[PDB]
Design a protein around this ligand. Structure first.
Ligand SMILES: C[S@@+](CC[C@H](N)C(=O)[O-])C[C@H]1O[C@@H](n2cnc3c(N)ncnc32)[C@H](O)[C@@H]1O
Length: 239
């Protein structure tokens, strides 16, 4: 089984893995298989295959939180090549997505992926969190924000919380170990106008690796001190 190889997208095995992984997460990815295949081809144009399929599926773990209803404005901060934002947008097309990265070439890739995949209501933006979150256009202007593989929670919270309108929520996607990053966090969240929401523990569907979705709730407006200047949160974190 799964022997088919294709020149320009996911292999027969790659397709099967994606669908199987989706089902384990409670998702039917059949309607999106060709879009994911094309996204994979784009990533290649820019064992390999299984790694990418895993990134697709890890991104899709966001859907294990009932946070994605209707046309919410969502920031994916430090999106890189578009994770977790592009998989999320593919499967939840009503979301109004802004994907930010400090690295121009990453942003250019995401912009091309949007154009090639024909996604509507998604845009890639070259910028620094610390700068954008002081613009009236972005500060406390999002209902949701997400980030994967960006920074320790103490730093990341200062980067994410100022984008959230009061009542909004952020998801910091984390790996197997969160104990140390979480320990000193709640007082720092308070300073930013946030509260710690749930920490959802889950196991990746094909690999069985542990993951944690850390939810940050936006409860009051972020004081004007935050975020501090580019690089400062990382050099002198709040916790
Ligand atoms: C290790 S990559 C992870 C990318 C993607 N989220 C993923 O999971 O595959 C971290 C990315 O965040 C971006 N980044 C880090 N700090 C940032 C900041 N303060 N503002 C905007 N982008 C940032 C970097 O340019 C880099 O592309």
């Amino acid at each position: 089984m799964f022997h088919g190889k294709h020149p320009g997208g996911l292999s027969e095995r790659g397709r099967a893995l994606l669908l199987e992984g989706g089902k384990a997460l409670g998702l039917d990815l059949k309607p999106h298989l060709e879009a994911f295949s094309r996204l994979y081809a784009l990533l290649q144009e820019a064992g390999e295959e299984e790694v990418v399929v895993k990134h697709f599926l890890d991104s899709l773990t966001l859907l294990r939180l009932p946070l994605w209803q209707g046309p919410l404005r969502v920031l994916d901060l430090g999106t890189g090549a578009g994770f977790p934002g592009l998989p999320l947008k593919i499967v939840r097309p009503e979301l109004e997505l802004v994907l930010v990265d400090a690295t121009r070439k990453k942003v250019a890739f995401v912009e091309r992926a949007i154009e090639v995949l024909g996604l509507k209501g998604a845009r890639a933006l070259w910028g620094r969190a610390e700068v954008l979150a002081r613009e009236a256009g972005h500060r406390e202007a999002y209902a949701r924000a997400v980030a994967r593989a960006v920074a320790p929670l103490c730093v990341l919270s200062e980067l994410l919380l100022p984008f959230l309108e009061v009542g909004g929520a952020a998801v910091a996607m984390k790996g197997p170990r969160v104990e140390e990053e979480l320990a000193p966090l709640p007082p720092a969240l308070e300073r930013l106008g946030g509260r710690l929401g749930e920490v959802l523990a889950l196991q990746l569907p094909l690999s069985g690796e542990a993951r944690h979705l850390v939810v940050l709730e936006k409860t009051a407006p972020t004081p004007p001190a935050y975020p501090r200047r580019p690089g400062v949160p990382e050099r002198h974190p709040l916790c």
